[PDB]
Specification:
This is part of a larger assembly, with two copies of chain A. The first copy, chain A, is mostly loops and about 50 residues long. Helix content of chain A is about 0%, strand content about 10%. Chain A is built from no helices and two strands. The interface between A and B is small, with 6 and 7 residues. Chain A: This is Spike protein S1.
Chain lengths: ~50, ~50
């Protein structure tokens, strides 16, 4: 504990993800809306916006 | 017999197909889809992509 910054122990956690190339199982807190057919809408399916 | 006219039609169609195909090129960016870039990065780096 007597040493200054630069030599003190640091806990490192690395979060690794993959982007869109597989079915996703971890999602954000966003709420699901109902589906509408045959109308021009701006949709967000699992982080894919269109 | 009619290779010249068909050749012109083929070149025009091939050029449009190539131009459409070029949209699937990352060009040194993380993704080729603009919506993904907006949905994934902050404006300072999304502007770069």
């Amino acid at each position: 504990p007597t040493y200054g910054v630069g030599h003190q122990p640091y806990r490192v956690v690395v979060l690794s993800f993959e982007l869109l190339h597989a079915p996703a199982t971890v999602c954000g807190p966003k709420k699901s809306t109902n589906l509408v057919k045959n109308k021009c809408v701006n949709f967000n399916f699992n982080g894919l916006t269109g | 017999a009619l290779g010249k006219l068909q050749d012109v039609v083929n070149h025009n169609a091939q050029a449009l197909n190539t131009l459409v195909k070029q949209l699937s090129s990352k060009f040194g960016a993380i993704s080729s889809v603009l919506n993904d870039i907006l949905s994934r990065l902050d404006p300072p780096e999304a502007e770069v992509q």
